[PDB]
Amino acid sequence: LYFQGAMALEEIKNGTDISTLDIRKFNLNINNVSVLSKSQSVDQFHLSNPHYEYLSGGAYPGEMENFTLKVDKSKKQDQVFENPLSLKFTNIGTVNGKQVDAYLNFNKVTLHYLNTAQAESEMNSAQKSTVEFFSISELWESNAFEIGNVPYVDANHDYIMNKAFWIDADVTAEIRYADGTETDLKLVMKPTDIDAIDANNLKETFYVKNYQNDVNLRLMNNANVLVQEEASDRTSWIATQITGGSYNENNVSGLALRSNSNSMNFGYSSTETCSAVFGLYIEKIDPRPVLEVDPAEIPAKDGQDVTYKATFKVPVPGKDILAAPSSIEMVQKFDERLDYKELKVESGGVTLQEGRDYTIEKTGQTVTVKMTPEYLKGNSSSDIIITYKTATNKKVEESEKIDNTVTLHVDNLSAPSNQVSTALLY
Ligand code: NA
């Protein structure tokens, strides 16, 4: 059942329109990327309005940072490039008041020799020297990077081989709070347009390593026609049909993945000539919970009432978050100098009931409200308001202020409220 899957990977296929999600796409571009390290195998260069695939090919407007791999032209056989490229995107957004950075590490890129005349010919030509694997641009989508073996070229960079090798890129993306605090963000990727199949039946493939342990939720639209291949070390999604237009690229040949963590070790393998475009995302809990405290200041002494009111906005399934919540919890932790007394929970002008609508777990100063499966089934959209009654205790006079924050949990997602404080007088 939907509400008793603790730990279990949750896979969903439903009518949600993946092309119209309202999730947050992080800012990733040629202007906030830096190369933390790259091996000498990597040929990196800037292009402006590059040509697609061939020099005589169409030219597309935009700045791009392009990355290729120098191959050993004598080895007409698979070539492996360990850790060729490690990237940081500095300040991809502000979330919950904190700067977030992205890390993108190419763990390995393997070039699989195509064993054709065309491949041998590129290998033997004196003008070709590198193979395409990665680029950063907004030619296709905003805030995106591109993995694939389709060359981008201009008059001075026409050395990239065509259809000599297909590529398999093993990549780890991670999002991280710059300030060093624990990153509670759950990375989301949304591969789309996984639809290329070449003359030789190679198929465009997106994959996730350690899928079963690393992914929290996987969303498909009813129209999905990818083949999901579950193997020991990974799960892959394999092209089966051409798809055009954002709706089809998203729903027919696409999917959404929410990680168990701030990172995901994914992969991508091309055909003799294809590529895919990617952003990094998170779901939205916006607004954050709104926390209030009455009063703003008290006499520093035992038995003084302090009351917290927390207003929780519930994310909208299929817009802010990928799907209806399996669980919603609100976690409060009171300053040592406070004794918890009791709480009430309200929604839609009505006073919800402990037992029917929510339960309460207390462990020391930590008090958690858990909404029941019965409440969640009602798919209510209205704010949940929790009012916590506490009173100072005999420890108040031991920080000349008592601070409070409450945290909303939706599945494995969380968002902290604003912090409030009550001044201690004397
Ligand atoms: Na397509």
Residue numbers in the entry: -6 to 0, 36 to 426, 429 to 456
Manuscript excerpt for this entry:
The Sgo0707 protein consists of 1643 amino acids including a leader peptide, an N-terminal region, eight 84-amino acid repeat domains, five 88-amino acid repeat domains and a C-terminal domain containing the LPXTG sorting motif. Based on their related domain organization, our hypothesis was that the N-terminal region of Sgo0707 also represents an adhesive domain. Interestingly, binding to type-1 collagen was significantly reduced in the mutant strain. These data suggest that Sgo0707 plays a role in initial adherence of S. gordonii to type-1 collagen. Interactions between the wild-type strain and collagen-coated surfaces could be competitively inhibited using a recombinant polypeptide encompassing residues 36–458 of Sgo0707, suggesting that binding is mediated via the N-terminal region.
The structure of S. gordonii Sgo0707N was solved to a resolution of 2.4 Å by single anomalous dispersion using one crystal of SeMet substituted protein belonging to the I222 space group with four molecules in the asymmetric unit. The initial model was subsequently refined against native data to 2.1 Å resolution. The structure can be divided into two domains, N1 and N2, which both adopt β-sandwich folds with antiparallel β-sheets. The N1-domain is the largest domain (residues 36–311) harbouring a putative binding cleft which strengthens the original hypothesis of the N-terminal, non-repetitive domain, functioning as an adhesin. The pocket exhibits a predominantly negative surface potential formed by Glu81, Glu169, Glu174, Glu232, Asp221, Asp223, Glu277, Glu300 together with the polar residues Thr220, Asn278 Ser274, Ser303 and Cys302. In all four chains positive electron density is found in the cleft but this is more pronounced in chains A and D. Although the protein was crystallized without the addition of metal ions positive electron density, indicating a partly occupied metal ion was observed in association with Asp221 (OD1), Asp223 (OD2) and Thr271 (O) of the A-chain. Interestingly, the 1643 amino acid long protein contains only one cysteine, Cys302, and that single residue is located in the floor of the putative binding cleft in the N1-domain. To our surprise we found that the N1-domain, despite very low sequence similarity, exhibits a striking structural similarity to the variable domains of the AgI/II adhesins, also expressed by oral streptococci. Whereas the Sgo0707 cleft is predominantly negatively charged the AgI/II clefts are less charged and have a tightly bound metal ion. No isopeptide bonds are however observed in the Sgo0707 N2-domain and the residues in the equivalent lysine-asparagine positions are Leu319 and Asn434.
